[PDB]
């Protein structure tokens, strides 16, 4: 079973002895710190952590004993605060005396703004605020995936609109391939759910169950996929029987969309000789609701896509859209699912526009670039203490390193407001109490062991929408 | 609860209809594909996955039903293989008819060798081999962490031996700060355990429980930490009371080692004026077994370390060791726990050597660099099919992309052997049956729902050791 007394950085076990004496409150906030691009971030993932790890009776007699035995051997000493954890057990039946206020999930906030604040509601539990830092900071991950996935959506939207005149199929242009490329099972589900905030296509099944259990949707499932081949299902037929492999597969999925990887031996031979001549008759007869989706999987991403399109364009009836861009027949599409990140995605769609190919022809699949190749310093997600109460007097606290102004932190009690121009501003030093800036957009989502406010996955999707989508 | 029927890439659900008719055997392998850095890898983590996800009754009527309802909505169609999973449920009581062979955990294998293989034991379950590719491939992560952690140990070992003459304290030179920098709780456990294969210092508690549950050690715990301050335990005293904070903290932990972060306002001021003058008397009186460890946490890593060292060198009695390198008094040490990954680690220790500072003075903390900033293409961890049997005839299969020779896969039944010079070789096309390279080095570790071979964390530590240590 999960034990919250063991879900923290080791040194935090010794922190209760290090605060100023007569301290009755510790107030801390979380922010995607601003750096001297990712100028706005999608706040998502907190609700998952609250339900799975923080709510309810998280402290038992046995968990305190287990933690005591582990920490004694871990530190070679008895630094564990048994009294403090016992207090919570007896006074609150193991419920955390903590109040967490947070901006609504799905919200899109510029960098350098408070996203959530954490404080203790019992004077005896001043130490509890930064005890659960580690478990709350890990929300940087669904925030970063959702933010980075959305930024890619922006790029796709821009070029799809310029080359086709609309945004049809936009929410299916970036597919999640990264189930195998992530570090663990829990990570898979979390990351996949963050991607689904912006898109509808995924192969990471783990994210589906997370959303149903923790967020919920009106629709049965939030993510979809289609039948497809991998290299094993093709190579199993033997080197000399790739055509037999291909033919068999498209016949098995004649009435639904089907993707087939064609780069096992020679991507350019398959597209020109096999798809383009030998099995052309099985392709041109397909429905618009069930196209063949050719999948190159190696070589330079831009160069391979262009050459595949160049080949297919000469073997199939190509039309020109109203914007003047070349479009494949509705039964034939291409997916690039190898080596795709936010950087190469820009290079490909930009290169496609150069050669007058519409973005309608292409979908994208991203593995580790979408889910794994992300760190906490990308958005500088940080958790800092800003306000404490010692001897009944509250002081505004902050760090301000001489060698790095970028690591300076906010002072005092914080609040998030709309500016008169409709932008966001974080008020410091409790200045939000002057009520010059309207209502604080931070809401109590957790208090004294209960989840006090919840959002469905539908609300979150609406919040994280693009301006180009609203228009 | 975990459901193995929902623990795979979505398109794999459709693959059973895609193999050639009359396929009775699918045989697949896992390797860190070959491409001057990371020439060898540490095999670790597969045992965790076998015990948590693959062993015992993993199929139930409820799980089959649950998967059926999910996939019908997921594909907007019925493509799920209910009969196949029902066969396993009835015929084997939910145990997976799967044979997995593998190299011992902890083993250091050069790139491009078979690390493990997977094949179905029942003709009816040919599709099962690659169904579990996704859960098995995720072992890239403990492998990559273990490997990148060990490569950092090589660097530290090299420079510690050079500037001190021995390897004392090496297993405590790279500390794990990665708990908050990782993508989840589960990853934190797996990643931290992978680090503990090479070192002993960790702050990620979750790694200890994983080792105890899945590997076990002779000692009560495989990892250790010391009391330390964070930026909140210092700043809470107010900007005008940093000295008050320092004094309170080093007095609470006056007989045990303690680390104090000193860059909240001015790192160079805290070292020169606060540690070096005002509270100097509290430092010089400390036991050697309980040193103060100063921790900067900002600025250029190398520049900050050197300047901090030069300041303390003029405030405290510095000696010179038998190698000619400068050494702080035994009650005073430094830890750099910011911006540390394998590249900057190399830059710092080399920089210290040039300025005649011993590596004995310093230890390193790493967060995302150690546990998060890693992907699957770093060691090119891959899972591919190499052998199938259709119509009672074995076929050696492979991929060979015309545009990428590096993505070429191995052919046929594989085996791992010792060369006459004592190196590793992977034999293809069943050539291991010729018995010209001796015995196969892979062991059977999973058969028909049962873990058939395991390793203690101590044995894994022994196998992973550096040559210089041996
Ligand atoms: O091919 C894979 N999956 C199948 C697949 C096929 C097409 C599309 S699509 O985006 O074209 C698409 C989406 C969709 F929802 C409706 C639709 F009509 C068209 C997406 C996904 C796959 C999965 C994981 N991987 C890991 C490593 N490699 C892979 C490969
Ligand atoms: O300071 C942190 N932890 C405390 C700490 C301090 C010093 C050493 S040590 O390597 O000096 C050491 C090790 C040991 F086992 C014996 C010993 F004597 C000396 C190790 C650990 C810490 C933890 C997580 N973080 C995340 C972000 N930042 C942090 C910081």
Curated annotation (Swiss-Prot), chain A:
Pfam families referenced in this protein's UniProt entry, alphabetically: NAMPT_N (PF18127), NAPRTase (PF04095)
Record entry for activity regulation: Inhibited by FK866. FK866 competes for the same binding site as nicotinamide, but due to its very low dissociation rate, it is essentially an irreversible inhibitor.
Superkingdom of origin organism: Eukaryota
The protein, known as: Nicotinamide phosphoribosyltransferase
Catalytic activity as recorded in UniProt: beta-nicotinamide D-ribonucleotide + diphosphate = 5-phospho-alpha-D-ribose 1-diphosphate + nicotinamide + H(+)
Modified residues annotated as Phosphotyrosine in this record: 172
GO biological process, one term: positive regulation of cell population proliferation
Cysteine pairings via disulfide bonds: none
Entry keywords, A to Z: Acetylation, Biological rhythms, Cytokine, Cytoplasm, Glycosyltransferase, Nucleus, Phosphoprotein, Pyridine nucleotide biosynthesis, Secreted, Transferase
The species this protein was found in: Homo sapiens (Human)
Any one GO molecular function term: cytokine activity
InterPro entries to which the protein is assigned, alphabetical: Aldolase_TIM, DUF5598, N/Namide_PRibTrfase, Nicotinamide_PRibTrfase, Nicotinate_pribotase-like_C
């Amino acid at each position: 079973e999960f034990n919250i007394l063991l879900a923290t950085d080791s040194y935090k076990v010794t922190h209760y002895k290090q605060y100023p004496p007569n301290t009755s409150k510790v107030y801390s906030y979380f922010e995607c710190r601003e750096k001297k691009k990712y100028e706005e971030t999608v706040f998502y993932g907190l609700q998952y952590i609250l339900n799975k790890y923080l709510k309810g009776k998280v402290v038992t007699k046995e968990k305190i004993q287990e933690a005591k035995d582990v920490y004694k051997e871990h530190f070679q000493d008895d630094v564990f605060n048994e009294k403090g954890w016992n207090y919570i057990l007896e006074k609150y039946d193991g419920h955390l005396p903590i109040e967490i206020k947070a901006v609504p999930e799905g919200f899109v906030i510029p960098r350098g703004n408070v996203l959530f604040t954490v404080e203790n509601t019992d004077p005896e539990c001043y130490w509890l605020t930064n005890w659960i830092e580690t478990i709350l900071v890990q929300s940087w991950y669904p925030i970063t995936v959702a933010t980075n996935s959305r930024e890619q959506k922006k790029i796709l939207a821009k070029y799809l609109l310029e080359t086709s005149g609309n945004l049809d199929g936009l929410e299916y242009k970036l597919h999640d391939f990264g189930y195998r490329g992530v570090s663990s099972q829990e990570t898979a589900g979390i990351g996949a759910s963050a991607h689904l905030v912006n898109f509808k296509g995924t192969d990471t099944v783990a994210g589906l169950a997370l959303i149903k259990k923790y967020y919920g949707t009106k629709d049965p499932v939030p993510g979809y996929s289609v039948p497809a081949a991998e290299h094993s299902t093709i190579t199993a037929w033997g080197k000399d029987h790739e055509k037999d492999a291909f033919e068999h597969i498209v016949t098995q999925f004649s009435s639904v969309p089907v993707s087939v990887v064609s780069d096992s031996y020679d991507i350019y031979n398959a597209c020109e000789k096999i798809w383009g001549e030998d099995l052309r008759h099985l392709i041109v007869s397909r429905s618009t609701q069930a196209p063949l989706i050719i999948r190159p999987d190696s070589g330079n991403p831009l160069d391979t896509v262009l050459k595949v399109l160049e080949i297919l364009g000469k073997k199939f009836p190509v039309t020109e859209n109203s914007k003047g861009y070349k479009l494949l027949p509705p039964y034939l599409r291409v997916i690039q699912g190898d080596g795709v990140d936010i950087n190469t995605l820009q290079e490909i769609v930009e290169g496609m526009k150069q050669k007058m190919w519409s973005i309608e022809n292409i979908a994208f699949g991203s593995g580790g670039g979408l889910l794994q190749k992300l760190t906490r310093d990308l958005l500088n997600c940080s958790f800092k203490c800003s306000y404490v109460v010692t001897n009944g007097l509250g002081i505004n606290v902050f760090k301000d390193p001489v060698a790095d102004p970028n690591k300076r932190s906010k002072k005092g009690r914080l609040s998030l407001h709309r500016t008169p121009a409709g932008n966001f501003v974080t008020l410091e030093e409790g200045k939000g109490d002057l009520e010059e800036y309207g209502q604080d957009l931070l809401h109590t989502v957790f208090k004294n062991g209960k989840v006090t406010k919840s959002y469905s996955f539908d609300e979150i999707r609406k919040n994280a929408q693009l301006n180009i989508e609203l228009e």
